[PDB]
Structure 1
Amino acid sequence: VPYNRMKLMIVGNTGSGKTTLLQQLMGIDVKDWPILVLNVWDFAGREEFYSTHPRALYLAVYDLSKGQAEVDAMKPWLFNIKARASSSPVILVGTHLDVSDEKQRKACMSKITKELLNKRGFPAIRDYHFVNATEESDALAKLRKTIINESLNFKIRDQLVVGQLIPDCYVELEKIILSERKNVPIEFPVIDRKRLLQLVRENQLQLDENELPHAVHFLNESGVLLHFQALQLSDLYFVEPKWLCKIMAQILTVGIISRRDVEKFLSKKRKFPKNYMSQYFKLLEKFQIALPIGEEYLLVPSSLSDHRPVIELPHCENSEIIIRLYEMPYFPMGFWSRLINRLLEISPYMLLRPNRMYWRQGIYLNWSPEAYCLVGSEVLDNHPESFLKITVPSCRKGCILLGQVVDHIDSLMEEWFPGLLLLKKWALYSFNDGEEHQKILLDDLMKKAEEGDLLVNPDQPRLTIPISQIAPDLILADLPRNIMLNNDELEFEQAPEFLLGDGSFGSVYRAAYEGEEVAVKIFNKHTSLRLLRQELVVLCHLHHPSLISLLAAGIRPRMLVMELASKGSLDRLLQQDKASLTRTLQHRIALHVADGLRYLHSAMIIYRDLKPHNVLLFTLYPNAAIIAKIADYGPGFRAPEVARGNVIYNQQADVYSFGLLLYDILTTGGRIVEGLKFPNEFDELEIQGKLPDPVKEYGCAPWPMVEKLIKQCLKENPQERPTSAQVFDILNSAELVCLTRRILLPKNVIVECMVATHHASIWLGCGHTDRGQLSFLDLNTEGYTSEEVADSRILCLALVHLPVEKESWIVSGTQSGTLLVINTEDGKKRHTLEKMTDSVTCLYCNFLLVGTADGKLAIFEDKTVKLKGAAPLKILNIGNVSTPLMCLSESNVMWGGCGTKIFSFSNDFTIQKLIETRTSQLFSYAAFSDSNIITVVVDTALYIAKQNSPVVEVWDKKTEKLCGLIDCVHFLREVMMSYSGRVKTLCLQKNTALWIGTGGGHILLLDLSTRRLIRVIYNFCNSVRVMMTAQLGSLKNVMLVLGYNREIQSCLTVWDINLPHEVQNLEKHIEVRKELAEKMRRTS
């Protein structure tokens, strides 16, 4: 709809009377003026808003009776206007003509015809008038006509350039919001409820990701409400303009003042939340009201004395100091307060606190007679131009100070006062102490710097000056010793065959430095020096192992020598050699990139460009201290948020990009990268966020943990995405590396036993129902079936393998005592062996050993079990009706548990010893010692776990003695009723790793050679049921951990058997790099 509102800006210097002018025509006095409704903002006072947060007409007003001096005073205003809205209309009105002779009128008339109306650099003043007085005038009648017609003309001009007129149509929903924001009654008008207000007005502009940002954008430009977009009080805090302006302006007037006393007053004036108060102070900085000095003080630039304090400097002879001048036509408004804010952090030691003094127009730092610094404004007669003077003592520390000062000045101007980049830079020098200084432009000194000569007096050769004394910042004399270029080491040709690449900065060549391969950036005639120094500022102070460091810089040919990667870009590797890209290598690359991001984010630097092209590899050797680095720190791969082209980049944009990188690493084919070849789908795909399952879609081997990390990372909402610090913490995990698969079982399925086929599937029992039900899991497809095969509940399964006969059978022992034997090659071949006198408690198998609940052990001949109703070879009575057999272990002598005794068998099945273990109660606790044995692990000692024990007993089988206890509670006691500490199962690996499962979702990794805790693996599931060691169909060894996850959920987790080693190796890797980070940062 045809929006008919436009802002009116009234500006001028203090004393003009322009407020009354407005009243006759009809911080800041804001009010509507229906004529066309103008939103009039009367900047009667010094409301920095015109620079601190800069469809409007600029009415400039000045007092004619003051004259031409005032006209010149308006140049900074005109500059600022052009600098933010060069296309906007400007009407210049002089006033108080009734007390100003026409001499002044025509003097000022000629003044503006000579210096403003036809002068570039000013925003082409559209018209002008002279007014007798604010009482009314024919001139004002004409002015009213001028303003109306010209504002119409302006919008016509916008249509010619922008494409919008004074009835330009804007989405009506935005118009509605304006009205909704108008209707707001809040005591402390800081708004967050806006989300609700959207919901109050039905739900308009529902594209929160696009329309909402546009509405907000409009609302600031239209002068309705204020976002403050890195402040915390920014996005969710829309504040009424009247309060922003009023309160901050008043507090200024309510010069060093302690923060706390300001807080005291403020708390009485307006009871802001202390959180808001911290932001309040941050806003005072942002809006140039007050600058932070120490953490307890504010400078308050405005109102500082403007009578440069008497300063006596040490050093007097010309050669003792260095002087630099900046010639300007006028200082921009706010130039000084911004400059001061930057200069306050200067320090010659950053590579005692200084006696600081403030002039408003200058800063004096003292430090020491050895090194001090004075920056301030000075003006000479017959030179209308104003200008800066910088003075430092001529020595290395003085140089360092100078470098920091001029870098801040140039950066200030590039960001805030472009257009000037005027700024005639002069250096002062003399050929003899006691004489006057001579001026020279730095450009000419640069011409001489290229020669490398001494400055020579053209009339007298005897008089020369080393350039460094005049301009030690042209020659890079302020570099750290560590990066000064040694010209006897650097070896390069600048020949075509060494060209590695180029850019707007010049070119890059391959070279040698101190015997190493390096890259040399050359600033080959591209506004050099300034670009060079900008790069030097960024490169220094960033010293992380994952970044490309600077290996010395040198002004003689203007070079940056940097580390050259030996294996090249990740991109190439992804499309060059998947064999190098092992699972181990991939993980390490992810860590190194994550560190770089964490570091740069803590350094307040947004990378904005992660991709395989920017990742460099320095060795493909998986176990190296440093593998990947991020290039050039300081396309179709964009976050969907920033892809809109209407928001601001931040760490969350980088995180999103990182997630995509990880996705690209996961699928080593670079399949989405291949998608780039069809960019119309590729860029949109990323925008949609609808990425395909990396496993299913590309045929990529499973990698859980990472898979969910990517999903967690790539969220639509920036506020829901993980921080880069968190991303790293997640990557920092042995579990991440070694977890390979996780299969959930169907809801309410309880498996009490497992048999993996050593040849890729698992036979599962089922204790959920009370019926003999046998299930089956296909690891190749995660397929699952199940059928009832017996009456009573299946207790134990065993695999009979007869490779000689080319067949195999599953033996199912159950509660009834029967043995159901089923051919694995033929489901129809089912038969039952001689029924046992009691239930089957365990199976082992060659002989099929059947341990029953009455302590009886049946031994069946290897092949005999094929026949239905077959009897065992022999039967032993080991225990009794109350002492069931529960474990047959063997690692050709058998060992096992019967009640509280440990038995052992010969190859003739004879008892070789009955070890009563109950006697261990002299140690530990009798209710733990006196309990049925659950499992026996046979190594160089026996490891016994008993039912409901928290302690594992270690026995010396050679002497039958207790040789130690393992307290599981203790280990988890060190870890900060899920902590039952009950031992569930024991598994043993011959590399000394001992795997102990427990009641809660924890797995302890112990070191058999020292009996020490390697690591606690936890938050696995609700409870661990069984653990198996099994070789997969790809010959990999893994742990099969079956657990409960009560909603009776249960699941199978597959771990890479080398977990114990990965835990230790990863830890080492990280610590080494941690030390290197400190090494680098400390050198500086």
Structure 2
Amino acid sequence: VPYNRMKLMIVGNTGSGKTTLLQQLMGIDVKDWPILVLNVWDFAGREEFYSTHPRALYLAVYDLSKGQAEVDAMKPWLFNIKARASSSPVILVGTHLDVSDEKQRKACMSKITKELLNKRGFPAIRDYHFVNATEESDALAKLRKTIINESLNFKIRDQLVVGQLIPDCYVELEKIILSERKNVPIEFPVIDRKRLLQLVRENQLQLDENELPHAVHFLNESGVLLHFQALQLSDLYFVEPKWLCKIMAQILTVGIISRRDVEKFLSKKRKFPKNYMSQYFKLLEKFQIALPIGEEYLLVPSSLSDHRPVIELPHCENSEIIIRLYEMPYFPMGFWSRLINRLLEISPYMLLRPNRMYWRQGIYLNWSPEAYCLVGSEVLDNHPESFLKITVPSCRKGCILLGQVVDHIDSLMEEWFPGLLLLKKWALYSFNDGEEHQKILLDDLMKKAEEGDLLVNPDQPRLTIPISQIAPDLILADLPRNIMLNNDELEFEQAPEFLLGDGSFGSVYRAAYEGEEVAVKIFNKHTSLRLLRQELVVLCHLHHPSLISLLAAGIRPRMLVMELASKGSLDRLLQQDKASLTRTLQHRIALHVADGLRYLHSAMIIYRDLKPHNVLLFTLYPNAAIIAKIADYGPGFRAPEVARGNVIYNQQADVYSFGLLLYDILTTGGRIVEGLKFPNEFDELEIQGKLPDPVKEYGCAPWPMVEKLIKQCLKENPQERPTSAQVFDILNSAELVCLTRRILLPKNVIVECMVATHHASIWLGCGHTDRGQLSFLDLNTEGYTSEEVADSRILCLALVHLPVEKESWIVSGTQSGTLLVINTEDGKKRHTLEKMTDSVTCLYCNFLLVGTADGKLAIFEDKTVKLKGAAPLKILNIGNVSTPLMCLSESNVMWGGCGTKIFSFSNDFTIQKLIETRTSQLFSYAAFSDSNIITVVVDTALYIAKQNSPVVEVWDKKTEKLCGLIDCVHFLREVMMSYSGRVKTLCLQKNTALWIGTGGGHILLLDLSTRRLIRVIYNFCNSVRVMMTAQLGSLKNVMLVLGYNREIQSCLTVWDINLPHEVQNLEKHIEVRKELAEKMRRTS
């Protein structure tokens, strides 16, 4: 709809009377003026808003009776206007003509015809008038006509350039919001409820990701409400303009003042939340009201004395100091307060606190007679131009100070006062102490710097000056010793065959430095020096192992010598050699990139460009201290948020990009990268966020943990995405590396036993129902079936393998005592062996050993079990009706548990010893010692776990003695009723790793050679049921951990058997790099 509102800006210097002018025509006095409704903002006072947060007409007003001096005073205003809205209309009105002779009128008339109306650099003043007085005038009648017609003309001009007129149509929903924001009654008008207000007005502009940002954008430009977009009080805090302006302006007037006393007053004036108060102070900085000095003080630039304090400097002879001048036509408004804010952090030691003094127009730092610094404004007669003077003592520390000062000045101007980049830079020098200084432009000194000569007096050769004394910042004399270029080491040709690449900065060549391969950036005639120094500022102070460091810089040919990667870009590797890209290598690359991001984010630097092209590899050797680095720190791969082209980049944009990198690493084919070849789908795909399952879609081997990390990372909402610090913490995990698969079982399925086929599937029992039900899991497809095969509940399964006969059978022992034997090659071949006198408690198998609940052990001949109703070879009575057999272990002598005794068998099945273990109660606790044995692990000692024990007993089988106890509670006691500490199962690996499962979702990794805790693996599931060691169909060894996850959920987790080693190796890797980070940062 045809929006008919436009802002009116009234500006001028203090004393003009322009407020009354407005009243006759009809911080800041804001009010509507229906004529066309103008939103009039009367900047009667010094409301920095015109620079601190800069469809409007600029009415400039000045007092004619003051004259031409005032006209010149308006140049900074005109500059600022052009600098933010060069296309905007400007009407210049002089006033108080009734007390100003026409001499002044025509003097000022000629003044503006000579210096403003036809002068570039000013925003082409559209018209002008002279007014007798604010009482009314024919001139004002004409002015009213001028303003109306010209504002119409302006919008016509916008249509010619922008494409919008004074009835330009804007989405009506935005118009509605304006009205909704108008209707707001809040005591402390800081708004967050806006989300609700959207919901109050039905739900308009529902594209929160696009329309909402546009509405907000409009609302600031239209002068309705204020976002403050890195402040905390920014996005969710829309504040009424009247309060922003009023309160901050008043507090200024309510010069060093302690923060706390300001807080005291403020708390009485307006009871802001202390959180808001911290932001309040940050806003005072942002809006140039007050600058932070120490953490307890504010400078308050405005109102500082403007009578440069008497300063006596040490050093007097010309050669003792260095002087630099900046010639300007006028200082921009706010130039000084911004400059001061930057200069306050200067320090010659950053590679005692200084006696600081403030002039408003200058800063004096003292430090020491050895090194001090004075920056301030000075003006000479017959030279209308104003200008800066910088003075430092001529020595290395003085140089360092100078470098920091001029870098801040140039950066200030590039960001805030472009257009000037005027700024005639002069250096002062003399050929003899006691004489006057001579001026020279730095450009000419640069011409001489290229020669490398001494400055020579053209009339007298005897008089020369080393350039460094005049301009030690043209020659890079302020570099750290560590990066000064040694010209006897650097070896390069600048020949075509060494060209590695180029850019707007010049070119890059391959070279040698101190015997190493390096890259040399050359600033080959591209506004050099300034670009060079900008790069030097960024490169220094960033010293992380994952970044490309600077290996010395040198002004003689203007070079940056940097580390050259030996294996090249990740991109190439992804499309060059998947064999190098092992699972181990991939993980390490992810860590190194994550560190770089964490570091740069803590350094307040947004990378904005992660991709395989920017990742460099320095060795493909998986176990190296440093493998990947991020290039050039300081396309179709964009976050969907920033892809809109209407928001601001931040760490969350980088995180999103990182997630995509990880996705690209996961699928080593670079399949989404291949998608780039069809960019119309590729860029949109990323925008949609609808990425395909990396496993299913590309045929990529499963990698859980990472898979969910990517999903967690790539969220639509920036506020829901993980921080880069968190991303790293997640990547920092042995579990991440070694977890390979996780299969959930169907809801309410309880498996009490497992048999993996050593040849890729698992036979599962089922204790959920009370019926003999046998299930089956296909690891190749995660397929699952199940059928009832017996009456009573299946207790134990065993695999009979007869490779000689080319067949195999599953033996199912159950509660009834029967043995159901089923051919694995033929489901129809089912038969039952001689029924046992009691239930089957365990199976082992060659002989099929059947341990029953009455302590009886049946031994069946290897092949005999094929026949239905077959009897065992022999039967032993080991225990009794109350002492069931529960474990037959063997690692050709058998060992096992019967009640509280440990038995052992010969190859003739004879008892070789009955070890009563109950006697261990002299140690530990009798209710733990006196309990049925659950499992026996046979190594160089026996490891016994008993039912409901928290302690594992270690026995010396050679002497039958207790040799130690393992307290599981203790280990988890160190870890900060899920902590039952009950031992569930024991598994043993011959590399000394001992795997102990427990009641809660924890797995302890112990070191058999020292009996020490390697690591606690936890938050696995609700409870661990069984653990198996099994070789997969790809010959990999893994742990099969079956657990409960009560909603009776249960699941199978597959771990890479080398977990114990990965835990230790990863830890080492990280610590080494941690030390290197400190090494680098400390050198500086």
2:605 is paired with a residue whose SS is: coil
Instruction: Report the CA distance between 1:1003 and its aligned residue.
Output: 0.0
2:181 is paired with a residue whose SS is: helix
Instruction: Report the CA distance between 1:865 and its aligned residue.
Output: 0.0
Match of 2:279 in 1: 279
The C-alpha deviation readout for 1:852-907, integer Å capped at 9, x for no partner, is: 00000000000000000000000000000000000000000000000000000000
- Distance (Å, rounded) in 1 between the aligned partners of 2:54 and 2:258: 30
The C-alpha deviation readout for 1:691-732, integer Å capped at 9, x for no partner, is: 000000000000000000000000000000000000000000
2:472 is paired with a residue whose SS is: coil
The C-alpha deviation readout for 1:452-478, integer Å capped at 9, x for no partner, is: 000000000000000000000000000
The C-alpha deviation readout for 1:332-368, integer Å capped at 9, x for no partner, is: 0000000000000000000000000000000000000
- Whether 1:1074 aligns to 2:1074 is yes
- Distance (Å, rounded) in 1 between the aligned partners of 2:700 and 2:185: 58
Instruction: Report the CA distance between 1:68 and its aligned residue.
Output: 0.0
- Distance (Å, rounded) in 1 between the aligned partners of 2:326 and 2:48: 24
2:912 is paired with a residue whose SS is: coil
- Whether 1:175 aligns to 2:175 is yes
Instruction: Report the CA distance between 1:630 and its aligned residue.
Output: 0.0
The C-alpha deviation readout for 1:396-415, integer Å capped at 9, x for no partner, is: 00000000000000000000
Match of 1:191 in 2: 191
2:735 is paired with a residue whose SS is: helix
Instruction: Report the CA distance between 1:1056 and its aligned residue.
Output: 0.0
Match of 1:349 in 2: 349
2:434 is paired with a residue whose SS is: coil
Instruction: Report the CA distance between 1:386 and its aligned residue.
Output: 0.0
- Distance (Å, rounded) in 2 between the aligned partners of 1:328 and 1:312: 26
The C-alpha deviation readout for 1:30-82, integer Å capped at 9, x for no partner, is: 00000000000000000000000000000000000000000000000000000
Match of 2:407 in 1: 407
Instruction: Report the CA distance between 1:435 and its aligned residue.
Output: 0.0
- Distance (Å, rounded) in 2 between the aligned partners of 1:529 and 1:812: 83
The C-alpha deviation readout for 1:623-645, integer Å capped at 9, x for no partner, is: 00000000000000000000000
- Whether 1:901 aligns to 2:904 is no
- Distance (Å, rounded) in 2 between the aligned partners of 1:217 and 1:576: 46
Matches within 5 A, 1:99-498: 99-498=99-498
- Distance (Å, rounded) in 2 between the aligned partners of 1:439 and 1:295: 41
Instruction: Report the CA distance between 1:976 and its aligned residue.
Output: 0.0
- Distance (Å, rounded) in 2 between the aligned partners of 1:142 and 1:291: 45
Instruction: Report the CA distance between 1:604 and its aligned residue.
Output: 0.0
Instruction: Report the CA distance between 1:149 and its aligned residue.
Output: 0.0
Instruction: Report the CA distance between 1:164 and its aligned residue.
Output: 0.0
- Distance (Å, rounded) in 1 between the aligned partners of 2:735 and 2:1083: 35
Instruction: Report the CA distance between 1:733 and its aligned residue.
Output: 0.0
- Distance (Å, rounded) in 2 between the aligned partners of 1:280 and 1:775: 66
Instruction: Report the CA distance between 1:1069 and its aligned residue.
Output: 0.0
Instruction: Report the CA distance between 1:423 and its aligned residue.
Output: 0.0
The C-alpha deviation readout for 1:456-515, integer Å capped at 9, x for no partner, is: 000000000000000000000000000000000000000000000000000000000000
- Distance (Å, rounded) in 1 between the aligned partners of 2:1015 and 2:348: 48
The C-alpha deviation readout for 1:372-416, integer Å capped at 9, x for no partner, is: 000000000000000000000000000000000000000000000
Instruction: Report the CA distance between 1:254 and its aligned residue.
Output: 0.0
The C-alpha deviation readout for 1:409-438, integer Å capped at 9, x for no partner, is: 000000000000000000000000000000
Match of 1:1052 in 2: 1052
Match of 1:878 in 2: 878
- Distance (Å, rounded) in 2 between the aligned partners of 1:111 and 1:163: 35
The C-alpha deviation readout for 1:955-979, integer Å capped at 9, x for no partner, is: 0000000000000000000000000
Instruction: Report the CA distance between 1:92 and its aligned residue.
Output: 0.0
Instruction: Report the CA distance between 1:952 and its aligned residue.
Output: 0.0
1:860 is paired with a residue whose SS is: strand
1:936 is paired with a residue whose SS is: strand
Match of 1:572 in 2: 572
- Distance (Å, rounded) in 1 between the aligned partners of 2:307 and 2:996: 79
2:521 is paired with a residue whose SS is: strand
The C-alpha deviation readout for 1:200-258, integer Å capped at 9, x for no partner, is: 00000000000000000000000000000000000000000000000000000000000
1:309 is paired with a residue whose SS is: coil
1:363 is paired with a residue whose SS is: strand
Structure 1 vs Structure 2 CA RMSD: 0.0
Instruction: Report the CA distance between 1:284 and its aligned residue.
Output: 0.0
- Structure 2 residue runs of 5 or longer lacking an equivalent are none
- Distance (Å, rounded) in 1 between the aligned partners of 2:836 and 2:128: 115
The C-alpha deviation readout for 1:134-173, integer Å capped at 9, x for no partner, is: 0000000000000000000000000000000000000000
Match of 2:618 in 1: 618
- Distance (Å, rounded) in 1 between the aligned partners of 2:258 and 2:128: 47
- Distance (Å, rounded) in 1 between the aligned partners of 2:749 and 2:120: 83
- Distance (Å, rounded) in 2 between the aligned partners of 1:594 and 1:167: 51
The C-alpha deviation readout for 1:1035-1084, integer Å capped at 9, x for no partner, is: 00000000000000000000000000000000000000000000000000
The C-alpha deviation readout for 1:816-856, integer Å capped at 9, x for no partner, is: 00000000000000000000000000000000000000000
- Distance (Å, rounded) in 2 between the aligned partners of 1:907 and 1:500: 73
Instruction: Report the CA distance between 1:921 and its aligned residue.
Output: 0.0
- Distance (Å, rounded) in 2 between the aligned partners of 1:456 and 1:837: 116
Instruction: Report the CA distance between 1:573 and its aligned residue.
Output: 0.0
2:681 is paired with a residue whose SS is: helix
1:163 is paired with a residue whose SS is: coil
- Distance (Å, rounded) in 1 between the aligned partners of 2:1025 and 2:656: 39
- Distance (Å, rounded) in 2 between the aligned partners of 1:456 and 1:414: 33
- Distance (Å, rounded) in 2 between the aligned partners of 1:655 and 1:583: 22
Instruction: Report the CA distance between 1:659 and its aligned residue.
Output: 0.0
1:643 is paired with a residue whose SS is: helix
- Distance (Å, rounded) in 1 between the aligned partners of 2:837 and 2:1002: 38
- Distance (Å, rounded) in 1 between the aligned partners of 2:391 and 2:258: 30
Instruction: Report the CA distance between 1:177 and its aligned residue.
Output: 0.0
Instruction: Report the CA distance between 1:663 and its aligned residue.
Output: 0.0
- Distance (Å, rounded) in 2 between the aligned partners of 1:596 and 1:31: 51
Instruction: Report the CA distance between 1:324 and its aligned residue.
Output: 0.0
1:809 is paired with a residue whose SS is: strand
- Distance (Å, rounded) in 2 between the aligned partners of 1:398 and 1:371: 5
Instruction: Report the CA distance between 1:582 and its aligned residue.
Output: 0.0
- Distance (Å, rounded) in 2 between the aligned partners of 1:690 and 1:876: 65
- Distance (Å, rounded) in 1 between the aligned partners of 2:273 and 2:771: 66
1:798 is paired with a residue whose SS is: strand
- Distance (Å, rounded) in 2 between the aligned partners of 1:529 and 1:23: 54
Instruction: Report the CA distance between 1:671 and its aligned residue.
Output: 0.0
The C-alpha deviation readout for 1:901-935, integer Å capped at 9, x for no partner, is: 00000000000000000000000000000000000
The C-alpha deviation readout for 1:175-217, integer Å capped at 9, x for no partner, is: 0000000000000000000000000000000000000000000
1:279 is paired with a residue whose SS is: helix
Match of 1:594 in 2: 594
- Distance (Å, rounded) in 1 between the aligned partners of 2:289 and 2:1029: 70
- Distance (Å, rounded) in 2 between the aligned partners of 1:950 and 1:205: 61
The C-alpha deviation readout for 1:77-136, integer Å capped at 9, x for no partner, is: 000000000000000000000000000000000000000000000000000000000000
2:294 is paired with a residue whose SS is: coil
- Distance (Å, rounded) in 2 between the aligned partners of 1:594 and 1:516: 27
Structure 1 runs, 4 residues or longer, greater than 3 Å off: none
- Distance (Å, rounded) in 1 between the aligned partners of 2:160 and 2:36: 20
- Distance (Å, rounded) in 2 between the aligned partners of 1:440 and 1:890: 94
- Distance (Å, rounded) in 1 between the aligned partners of 2:752 and 2:19: 88
- Distance (Å, rounded) in 1 between the aligned partners of 2:591 and 2:454: 52
